[model samples]
Target: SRYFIMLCDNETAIAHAKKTSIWAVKKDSSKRISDAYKKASVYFIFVAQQTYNALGYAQVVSDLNSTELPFWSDSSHAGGVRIKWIKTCNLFSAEISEIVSHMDHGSEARDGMEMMYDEGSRLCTLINYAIMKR
Candidate 1:
């Protein structure tokens, strides 16, 4: 899975993203995400700050170096990635803890868009099961 985990603290930003179809991040991080985009299609596992549970996954439509929509309440992230929600978990019980526990030995979770190769598939499998149960 060419997916990255995006930890989102601001629910407002997710709300805005629903309408605007974009997620913003630091310029440097955006470049990295863009670099990933160059290799393959980018996807995200949006996690909430309050619960540390994932909301769901989305597919990146495009990457923008600059944004003017004012989607985020905080303007710190100057770069934006346009995306569409492939599926919404509706705050389903996709906890980040579960994600961490599945990682290989010595692996650690971090903020921003971090990629896990084999471990990510496990997370996605969980997502698939959760979605099926819905």
Candidate 2:
């Protein structure tokens, strides 16, 4: 329902996507990732790399890959569906990380969606002022 962090080590793939209009995240995702995208502008964040402490944000566009495409991962994630990202909004600073850090470890510690929905609005505000502002 709001902006959140999802830990994925796919910066190389994501960077490559920036060259094109469509960014495809092929993986296993069940109701969690599937439902999150339908909530309109349900943005997801990830680290640029290990040295990069900040987070990169991307909003889901187009229909869920699950409904249209087929699963092909041999790993456990293959059990779910993949997602598509049109573009990343920004690579935010540590300030944004601090906020999510407090996002109920039980909820935000792992991968998947950060259901601390209220935190997302604040994230959008800070990123705007800190990075997007003129």
Candidate 3:
């Protein structure tokens, strides 16, 4: 037996992802055009335990502590907290990247991965539940 895959638009999928609050921004200014503006939102599922410790902000600080700039340690707050994850995600889609990046930014890297993973898992559970109910 073959299973039929349903195709949903990016906007629809993003809407579903947003319902969980685990996804990020939803649009990018650079992608915007004309008076109407074109919007894009990206969704990411972070699996840190199975993957790299990609979530926590402390890890970034620790990594940067020895650097010349020491941006993570700067007392000015601007240089003090680095938003690398968000910046990285921004390179992809707007929305999903924003959410993940926001949380990862200024977060303790050690706990950041676990936190993001937990949230992503929760969102997945919710999505599955909704599908089953439907």
Q: Say which candidate scores most in lDDT.
A: 1
Q: What C-alpha lDDT do the candidate models reach, one value each? A: 0.67, 0.50, 0.25
Query: What's the C-alpha lDDT at position 120 in model 1?
Result: 63
RMSD of 3: 17.7
Query: What tens digits encode model 3's per-residue C-alpha lDDT throughout 27-122?
Result: 221121111111212223332322221221111211111122221122321111111222111012223233344444554222212234444444
Can you give the lDDT of residue 102 in candidate 3?
A: 43
- Candidate 1's TM-score reads 0.79
The residue pairs that clash in candidate 1, if any, are none
Model 2 segments more than 4 A misplaced: 21-29, 49-52, 66-92, 106-108
The TM-scores of all predictions, comma-separated, are 0.79, 0.60, 0.20
lDDT of 1 at 84: 83
Give the number of colliding residue pairs in candidate 3.
Answer: 11
Better of 2 and 3 by TM-score: 2
lDDT of 1 at 1: 40
Q: Write the per-residue lDDT of candidate 2 for residues 1-134, one digit (tens) a residue.
A: 55545554565554554444233333534455556667666676554434333444557565444334322223344232233442344465676667655665533344554646666666656666665542
In the range 40-127, model 1's lDDT, one tens digit per residue, is 8778777665565657778887865574444563555757777888766654464545665344354545556556666566666677
